[PDB]
Amino acid sequence: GNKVHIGKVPIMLRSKFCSLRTLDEVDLYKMKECPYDMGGYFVIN
């Protein structure tokens, strides 16, 4: 009995579990993300 995988939860952008919460201003451009984007939405398909 250990970490069994039960599913995948979609992540809201710019939230605490998003990859863009870090990365500062400069790296946000290298990832082709607009710094004016505010997050708050999911990406499904």
Partner 1 sequence: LSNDEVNSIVKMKQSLSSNTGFNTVLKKAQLQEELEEARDAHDHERVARIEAELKSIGAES
Partner 2 sequence: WEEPRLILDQPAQHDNINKRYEIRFGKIYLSRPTMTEADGTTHAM
Partner 3 sequence: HTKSVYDNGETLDISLPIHPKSHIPQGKQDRWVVKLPDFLDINAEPFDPRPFEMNVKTHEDKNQELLDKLIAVNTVRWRYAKSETGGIFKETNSQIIQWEDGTYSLRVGSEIFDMFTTNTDDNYLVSEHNEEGILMTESTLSKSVKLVPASFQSTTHQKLAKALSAKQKKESYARSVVTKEDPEERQRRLESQENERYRLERRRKQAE
Task: By CB under 8 A, tell whether 5 contacts partner 3.
Answer: yes
Task: By CB under 8 A, tell whether 13 contacts partner 1.
Answer: no
Binding site partner of 36, from partner 2, partner 1, partner 3, none, Cβ cut-off 5-8 A by kind:
none
The CA distance from 20 to 24, in Å, is: 8
Task: By CB under 8 A, tell whether 23 contacts partner 1.
Answer: yes
Binding site for partner 2 (CB under 8 A): 1, 3, 9, 11, 17-19
